[PDB]
Amino acid sequence: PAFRTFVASDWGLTHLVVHEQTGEVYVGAVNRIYKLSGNLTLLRAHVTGPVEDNEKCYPPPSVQSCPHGLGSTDNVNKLLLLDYAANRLLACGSASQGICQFLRLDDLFKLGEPHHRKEHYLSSVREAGSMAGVLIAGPPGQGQAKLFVGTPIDGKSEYFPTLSSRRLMANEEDADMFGFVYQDEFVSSQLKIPSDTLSKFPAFDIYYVYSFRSEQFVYYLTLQLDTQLAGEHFFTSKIVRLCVNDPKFYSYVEFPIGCEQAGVEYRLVQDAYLSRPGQALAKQLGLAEDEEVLFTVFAQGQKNRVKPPKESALCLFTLRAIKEKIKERIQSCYRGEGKLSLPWLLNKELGCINSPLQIDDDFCGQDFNQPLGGTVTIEGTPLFVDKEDGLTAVAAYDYQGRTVVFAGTRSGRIRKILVDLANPSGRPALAYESVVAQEGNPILRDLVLSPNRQYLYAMTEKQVTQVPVESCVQYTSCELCLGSRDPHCGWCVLHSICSRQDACERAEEPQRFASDLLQCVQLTVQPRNVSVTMSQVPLVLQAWNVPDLSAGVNCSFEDFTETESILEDGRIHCHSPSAREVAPITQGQGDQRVVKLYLKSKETGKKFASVDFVFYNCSVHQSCLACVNGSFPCHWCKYRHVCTNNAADCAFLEGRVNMSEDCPQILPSTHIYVPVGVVKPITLAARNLPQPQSGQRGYECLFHIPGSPARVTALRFNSSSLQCQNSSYSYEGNDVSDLPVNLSVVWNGNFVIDNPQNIQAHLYKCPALRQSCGLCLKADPRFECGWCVAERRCSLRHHCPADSPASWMHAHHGSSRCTDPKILKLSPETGPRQGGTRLTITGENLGLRFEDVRLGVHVGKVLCSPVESEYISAEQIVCEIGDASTLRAHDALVEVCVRDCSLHYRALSPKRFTFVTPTFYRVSPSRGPLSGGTWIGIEGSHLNAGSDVAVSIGGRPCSFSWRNSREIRCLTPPGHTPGSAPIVININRAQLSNPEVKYNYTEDPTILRIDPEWSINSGGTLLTVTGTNLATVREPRIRAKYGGIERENSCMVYNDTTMVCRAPSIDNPKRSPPELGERPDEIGFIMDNVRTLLVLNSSSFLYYPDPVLEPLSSPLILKGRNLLPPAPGNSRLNYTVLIGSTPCILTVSETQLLCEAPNKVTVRAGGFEFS
């Protein structure tokens, strides 16, 4: 399927609304207002735009001449409101001091556009969506239609009211339009900004986000400025209310609003949506049917209303609960308690006047204690929190009780949330996510469900998108359908599709529609496994949770065949396909084919229920073991040497194998030893070896040697023993002494007998791997291979002459001392005098038992105790050296005495082991942060000695890296308390100290300010960073996370407080920063192990896009977009235009580059380059 869509050809869009009768969609935009069909085809386009004008001008040029220069500017649709009563559309713009338009409902015919009087002007403000309001009407002749409307003011306090109650006459040409409901010289149905409050706080302003009529009132969710929170701008999100029938404006109330999630504040409204909850949420939230509810979206903190944070939270307010907070607050001021507390309105705080009254929800305000504020900020019930992708918009609706919530994202995605706090579940769960403008066009607050409530029109900066509330057809299986949980979806069993109740034909009937996973179709077949050779087999089918199929059913194994079935009891009876049909499937897939046997219903003609059905083919098994000891019923024919399902297909009666133990198989004996180049027979045992029959040859042994494969014919003595005949074997290499070889026993040329234990023949050569007595007697007693004195080499008795009765020596049981031990080399060459070192000696002709080498090892005089486990016989001894403090020598040769220190049986090391006492004198940072993670460089002498090393700062262990004669490098642990700390290094049994060389733990550095608060996509600009203890980190660097990519860059420390840093590149071909600017996912600094500095919560650092540049005595002029960003303060890019190597003196402008040239051209700005 494809998502129905309307694209914004030229400009940005601002507002959308749906006509409750027609389903026509009206769309407010900059310079345009469109009418669209339900499926988003363009129906009519109104030009409202580019108008010659100027914001500074009061009454706009039409009425009076203005001395300020005029220019063609864009007219932003600020507001849009459906007036069904007068068959039209209020289409309120800007850029004319905010004059309002009336477009006729069905053709967009301008009925009127009043702009003579001062009330016809709404606000200079050119910002979209900072305005809102509601249209409310009575019948013609009675109290006429009124408009309640909030807008920002931009400091034009005396020109416009922020909130107003205005008149809507039936004639659009009538001059009375947008006049106040009741005007007096004392009090008018409007609320102005006081001049005193603008003098005190310079640019205070009220931005109106959402607005709705409820019962008899009118609410507004608003954003205001710092007035008890001159300084900087911080915003407070509040609710406002009025009685509809209060011309005096005395009912005004104003409570701060937000919500908290695990100690994180969310105080900035982005959107809201009044709705119903339906039976579900209502009940367990404790409400009556017609009781209302308010879904909202808030961003984290109270910072940057112009560009809020990603961190966003969807909260909830029951209107009964806000009504109680307002009633509770009024029944409180009418007790005379405290002040009114409304900073921006009343600068000098007037007091609450006590009085006896019946305080009701019907209370519409009175003369004294007047317009009043709120102290207790109203907290909301949180539902879902996005941390990587900011929520932007919301809607909700009642579906068959269950409450579905819709949530726009900064990405251009919509979430479909069942709110389940009042529902059984642990917390409200996301059901589904969907895509609109994937590239990252944010969704806008104006997000309306259709009248039929089948779709949801989702608006972006650049496109409207008809997203269906229900799209269950994406669900392929009963198990996934009812698994998604998004409540519109059910499994329409007989159609085998997923959709709503009203879409499944005959759903009302028994078992025809499934709503809980337990209703899903469950199927089983009695003969699950059927052989390829069988045909038309009777199968019984048990199925549960299925409607009456007396309509008829067919069995289809897949889209290959289809057999008719008859019904009896609670079971279905159909037949397997014919052999003629079965094999066309199984051909190719060999061993077996699992196939999804369906049921095709006669009523629908769609497959719905399935099972795993197995088609097994015995024949493809090419050994007895696979055939019988497999998973299936298969018979093996000893004599034909073929696997098949039919007993009769076997050679004859006494050659059928049905049991795995009766297989023709080779049994193991104690290992098959085969010397190279020696004539030997190889007797084998086995079981049930076949008597070769008519036209069948005898047995052979085939040896799979990569060098040479030998074919030797054999004799089968009985059903249980074989023997390959006298022959010699070889391999070409002399590289490995012991080579195990795969052997296959064949008869009649190609019939290979089964080898389960996979018995091998070991071809051994008397050593091509061992030129030392110790190595030979080390190897198997099986080989018979032994060491022969005279030759100075090792071979069997067979291959070595007996000149003496004891000239050939073999390790009898290992009780064989071995001559002329030799040491090749030993590791650690140096060691500490205290000992404890593990000496690692590697020789060639050592002793064959441990208990003879133990006590034999010595380092000069020093007794060395050898280790059992780490000792590899006659190749290697691992030995632990004892205390060498008392030794006079500085270095000594190593000695091994095999068992006795006999004159021929002693070895002495070619180079000698050295004793030292390592010392240290300096550390190369002597200071570091308390969190630790500092790269320490301990300088000294003999530091590479011994085996183990352990460095302890304050008793706590250092993470070791590498060791040297002169240096030890390790990474510091966290310190307990800041200040001087002892450094203890222990090498084996030597523990060396120095109280003159200490390590000073410092208080963790802090980051305060980065100065410019921005950079470009490729980075590379200077950043003037300030903080504390910055000299205590030697190599600090900046870190930034943009999208799925993390990047780093260098810093240069100057003071303990100052640092210059080069901004990190975020160059991503997936995302590019917008012209407006964008915060990174994360920004911080890498400073050792101080991890709180890796991620900066309070940071407002922005990233702008890299410059766009156009290629091919008079000066150089280089044109292009994005040359200068809208940045705070002075701070701009240090551009340098160069020619081969020579820089020029240039003046930089927003679209052009004014270099100067005397007549290969490169432009640089930070880490950016272009030609």
Ligand SMILES: *[C@@H]1O[C@H](CO)[C@@H](O[C@@H]2O[C@H](CO)[C@@H](O[C@@H]3O[C@H](CO[C@H]4O[C@H](CO[C@H]5O[C@H](CO)[C@@H](O)[C@H](O)[C@@H]5O)[C@@H](O)[C@H](O[C@H]5O[C@H](CO)[C@@H](O)[C@H](O)[C@@H]5O)[C@@H]4O)[C@@H](O)[C@H](O[C@H]4O[C@H](CO)[C@@H](O)[C@H](O)[C@@H]4O)[C@@H]3O)[C@H](O)[C@H]2NC(C)=O)[C@H](O)[C@H]1NC(C)=O
């Ligand atoms: C269940 O599975 C079985 C087995 O997997 C399968 O039966 C196979 O059916 C296909 C037909 O599509 C056969 O494949 C074709 O074979 C053509 C020639 O067959 C000759 O060679 C056979 C192979 O001998 C090998 O196997 C034996 C024993 O393991 C081994 O000792 C040998 O060394 C050798 O490797 C041989 O079995 C066969 O003799 C059969 O037929 C006679 C007469 O009916 C019967 O008496 C025997 O008992 C025996 O069953 C015969 O001599 C060949 O033309 C063709 O090859 C061409 O096409 C391919 C692919 O395009 C090209 O790559 C190639 O270059 C050729 O141009 C093709 O391979 C296959 O031989 C059957 N398998 C067997 C064991 O016979 C069925 O799908 C399933 N059974 C059912 C009932 O559905």
Ligand SMILES: *[C@@H]1O[C@H](CO)[C@@H](O[C@@H]2O[C@H](CO)[C@@H](O[C@@H]3O[C@H](CO[C@H]4O[C@H](CO[C@H]5O[C@H](CO)[C@@H](O)[C@H](O)[C@@H]5O)[C@@H](O)[C@H](O[C@H]5O[C@H](CO)[C@@H](O)[C@H](O)[C@@H]5O)[C@@H]4O)[C@@H](O)[C@H](O[C@H]4O[C@H](CO)[C@@H](O)[C@H](O)[C@@H]4O)[C@@H]3O)[C@H](O)[C@H]2NC(C)=O)[C@H](O)[C@H]1NC(C)=O
């Ligand atoms: C051809 O088929 C055969 C036979 O089916 C198959 O044989 C396997 O051989 C390996 C050896 O390589 C066996 O591994 C051994 O396991 C020994 C313990 O066996 C007991 O426990 C088994 C596992 O118990 C779990 O699973 C079962 C069933 O799922 C469950 O009931 C239990 O609760 C538990 O979760 C169990 O399978 C087994 O029961 C078998 O035998 C009985 C009696 O015949 C029969 O009733 C069952 O039907 C079933 O076949 C039994 O209860 C373990 O002790 C052993 O290690 C020792 O023995 C060796 C040799 O004696 C010593 O050298 C060694 O030092 C140890 O002392 C070994 O690890 C494996 O269990 C066999 N598998 C089966 C299914 O029987 C081959 O794999 C097949 N070969 C080929 C080439 O296809």
Ligand SMILES: *[C@H]1O[C@H](CO)[C@@H](O[C@@H]2O[C@H](CO)[C@@H](O[C@@H]3O[C@H](CO[C@H]4O[C@H](CO[C@H]5O[C@H](CO)[C@@H](O)[C@H](O)[C@@H]5O)[C@@H](O)[C@H](O[C@H]5O[C@H](CO)[C@@H](O)[C@H](O)[C@@H]5O)[C@@H]4O)[C@@H](O)[C@H](O[C@H]4O[C@H](CO)[C@@H](O)[C@H](O)[C@@H]4O)[C@@H]3O)[C@H](O)[C@H]2NC(C)=O)[C@H](O)[C@H]1NC(C)=O
């Ligand atoms: C440790 O070392 C560091 C430096 O390594 C040091 O930090 C600087 O210290 C020096 C003095 O030693 C200060 O420089 C003085 O600035 C005086 C005027 O200040 C104005 O101009 C500043 C510099 O402009 C440069 O940088 C900007 C931005 O990068 C750039 O656009 C320009 O092109 C230009 O190159 C400017 O930063 C500063 O703005 C500060 O103040 C505002 C508002 O209060 C604040 O919001 C900012 O955050 C910012 O801090 C301001 O506009 C100037 O008069 C003075 O010149 C005298 O001294 C020189 C040399 O001794 C004499 O030759 C001359 O006759 C003058 O008497 C000098 O240039 C600089 O302000 C510090 N930097 C910062 C960021 O604070 C630490 O102080 C050192 N610690 C010590 C000394 O213990």
Ligand SMILES: *[C@@H]1O[C@H](CO)[C@@H](O[C@@H]2O[C@H](CO)[C@@H](O[C@@H]3O[C@H](CO[C@H]4O[C@H](CO)[C@@H](O)[C@H](O[C@H]5O[C@H](CO)[C@@H](O)[C@H](O)[C@@H]5O)[C@@H]4O)[C@@H](O)[C@H](O[C@H]4O[C@H](CO)[C@@H](O)[C@H](O)[C@@H]4O)[C@@H]3O)[C@H](O)[C@H]2NC(C)=O)[C@H](O)[C@H]1NC(C)=O
């Ligand atoms: C291929 O397709 C076939 C479909 O027919 C599948 O065969 C079925 O396998 C399952 C197990 O894999 C069997 O369930 C078991 O049933 C036994 C009781 O068996 C007795 O009753 C059977 C039905 O009433 C009957 O068919 C049996 O008779 C057979 O055996 C005789 C003698 O060998 C033979 O002559 C006949 O021809 C029959 O073949 C027999 O009297 C039951 O004891 C099992 O429970 C045990 O195991 C479980 C799990 O470990 C354990 O929890 C219990 O405690 C208990 O120990 C088990 O339920 C089923 O009976 C088979 N159906 C038939 C018709 O034989 C087969 O699975 C498919 N093959 C593969 C590889 O998938």
Ligand SMILES: *[C@@H]1O[C@H](CO)[C@@H](O[C@@H]2O[C@H](CO)[C@@H](O[C@@H]3O[C@H](CO[C@H]4O[C@H](CO)[C@@H](O)[C@H](O[C@H]5O[C@H](CO)[C@@H](O)[C@H](O)[C@@H]5O)[C@@H]4O)[C@@H](O)[C@H](O[C@H]4O[C@H](CO)[C@@H](O)[C@H](O)[C@@H]4O)[C@@H]3O)[C@H](O)[C@H]2NC(C)=O)[C@H](O)[C@H]1NC(C)=O
């Ligand atoms: C281990 O590491 C710690 C931390 O690095 C060391 O402590 C630091 O010592 C340095 C020496 O280089 C100090 O700098 C000097 O500060 C003194 C005056 O110190 C006073 O002022 C400080 C800054 O305003 C202030 O932080 C101090 O207060 C601390 O102590 C109290 C009480 O214990 C505590 O309650 C506080 O919380 C503070 O922690 C203190 O009142 C000054 O004389 C020096 O000035 C010289 O240099 C300047 C500039 O060049 C020059 O103009 C002058 O003429 C003069 O020559 C110098 O600034 C630093 O303040 C200490 N930092 C911390 C965090 O304590 C500690 O010494 C190390 N141990 C060892 C054994 O070396």
Ligand SMILES: *[C@@H]1O[C@H](CO)[C@@H](O[C@@H]2O[C@H](CO)[C@@H](O[C@@H]3O[C@H](CO)[C@@H](O)[C@H](O[C@H]4O[C@H](CO)[C@@H](O)[C@H](O)[C@@H]4O)[C@@H]3O)[C@H](O)[C@H]2NC(C)=O)[C@H](O)[C@H]1NC(C)=O
């Ligand atoms: C404007 O939007 C409207 C709806 O808001 C829309 O017109 C509708 O199109 C649908 C199909 O997209 C039509 O619904 C049909 O109703 C008839 C019964 O009269 C059925 O026969 C149709 O069934 C067919 O289609 C099924 C699903 O694809 C098939 O399974 C089946 O085999 C049939 O072929 C179908 O349910 C309907 O006619 C109108 N709606 C109304 C109220 O008339 C249209 O897409 C948009 N039009 C424009 C000009 O933009």
Ligand SMILES: *[C@@H]1O[C@H](CO)[C@@H](O[C@@H]2O[C@H](CO)[C@@H](O[C@@H]3O[C@H](CO)[C@@H](O)[C@H](O[C@H]4O[C@H](CO)[C@@H](O)[C@H](O)[C@@H]4O)[C@@H]3O)[C@H](O)[C@H]2NC(C)=O)[C@H](O)[C@H]1NC(C)=O
């Ligand atoms: C449920 O199962 C039943 C029985 O298993 C099954 O009945 C089948 O119906 C089709 C007709 O749709 C029969 O096929 C016909 O057979 C004649 C010969 O007698 C053929 O000449 C025809 O084949 C032509 O048409 C085909 C399809 O267009 C072409 O592929 C082909 O090239 C020919 O031109 C004709 O289709 C078939 O014989 C029976 N099946 C059996 C096993 O007899 C039916 O499909 C199912 N019932 C229902 C109501 O769906």
Ligand SMILES: *[C@@H]1O[C@H](CO)[C@@H](O[C@@H]2O[C@H](CO)[C@@H](O[C@@H]3O[C@H](CO)[C@@H](O)[C@H](O)[C@@H]3O)[C@H](O)[C@H]2NC(C)=O)[C@H](O)[C@H]1NC(C)=O
């Ligand atoms: C000597 O014989 C050995 C053992 O028989 C051979 O090594 C291994 O042979 C087995 C066959 O039993 C291979 O195992 C296979 O594994 C896959 C797993 O995906 C499985 O699907 C197959 O059914 C099969 O069991 C295994 O690949 C193979 N080992 C290696 C490393 O390839 C060996 O090939 C023989 N030596 C020589 C030199 O041929």
Ligand SMILES: *[C@@H]1O[C@H](CO)[C@@H](O)[C@H](O)[C@H]1NC(C)=O
């Ligand atoms: C060869 O084998 C036969 C029979 O096993 C035996 O008599 C003879 O000793 C063997 N010959 C040699 C040279 O090993």
